[PDB]
Amino acid sequence: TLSILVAHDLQRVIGFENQLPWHLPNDLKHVKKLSTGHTLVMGRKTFESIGKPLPNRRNVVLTSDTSFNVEGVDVIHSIEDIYQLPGHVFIFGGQTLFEEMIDKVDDMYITVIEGKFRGDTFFPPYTFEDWEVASSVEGKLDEKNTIPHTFLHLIRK
Ligand SMILES: NC(=O)C1=CN([C@H]2O[C@H](COP(=O)(O)OP(=O)(O)OC[C@H]3O[C@@H](n4cnc5c(N)ncnc54)[C@H](OP(=O)(O)O)[C@@H]3O)[C@@H](O)[C@H]2O)C=CC1
Ligand SMILES: CCc1nc(N)nc(N)c1C#C[C@H](C)c1cc(OC)cc(-c2ccncc2)c1
Numbered sequence: 510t511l512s513i514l515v516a517h518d519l520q521r522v523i524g525f526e527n528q529l530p531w532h533l534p535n536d537l538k539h540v541k542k543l544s545t546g547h548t549l550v551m552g553r554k555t556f557e558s559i560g561k562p563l564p565n566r567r568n569v570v571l572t573s574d575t576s577f578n579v580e581g582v583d584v585i586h587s588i589e590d591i592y593q594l595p596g597h598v599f600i601f602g603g604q605t606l607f608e609e610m611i612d613k614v615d616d617m618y619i620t621v622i623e624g625k626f627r628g629d630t631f632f633p634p635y636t637f638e639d640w641e642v643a644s645s646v647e648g649k650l651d652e653k654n655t656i657p658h659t660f661l662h663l664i665r666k
Contacts, residue, residue, distance in 0.1 A: 511591075513607065514543060514599040515632055516620035516658075522628030524603065527558040530626035535654045543618060547597040550585075553577065555602035569594065571606065604630045611635065616643070616664045623657035641666055 553572035562568035640663035
């Protein structure tokens with residue numbers, strides 16, 4: 510199973526100066542629920558921005574640096590190596606990798622942040638003509654989750 514796992518805002522911003530533009534604890538738990546026990550693939554810049562691999566799942570980093578090695582991180586150097594990964598595999602970031610992968614994945618788990626942030630990293634444009642809406646669930650606003658957001662699970666037609 511090959512999926513995209515992304516959060517972007519109303520203009521597809523997914524990042525600004527190595528950071529998430531928004532603090533949204535509910536989306537983290539959403540990420541933890543979907544990806545625990547499975548595989549996360551990410552480009553080198555996405556990984557360095559987190560700074561440590563995420564617990565209780567396989568962390569795979571794509572890079573051309575043959576010296577790259579991090580404890581708890583499996584390295585690949587080829588787009589093609591992604592397809593040799595066993596199990597449910599999530600493309601986690603960033604813009605470059607999504608651009609390479611958005612035409613290959615079976616489905617996408619998008620968190621739409623109903624806001625307009627300043628960004629420098631973008632999720633690629635996509636149209637609903639090509640994706641069926643398997644589910645659309647609004648996140649709940651509260652104390653710590655203060656921006657409207659929506660979980661989409663889109664499947665390719
Ligand atoms: N929401 C998110 O996913 C967030 C992501 N980011 C980031 O993404 C931003 C923009 O950078 P972006 O380039 O999209 O990040 P990526 O995570 O996609 O990293 C790109 C890197 O991945 C490696 N790579 C990609 N494709 C291949 C390939 N086909 N073969 C071998 N290696 C490959 C290269 O690593 P190498 O150069 O080592 O060879 C390349 O430089 C960064 O500023 C960073 O902060 C920032 C905040 C949030
Ligand atoms: C959740 C945000 C998020 N949500 C969804 N639904 N998909 C995603 N792919 C990401 C994402 C992301 C990037 C990799 C990111 C950047 C970052 O910059 C500091 C910190 C984290 C992060 C710190 C702590 N735990 C998990 C992830 C993740």
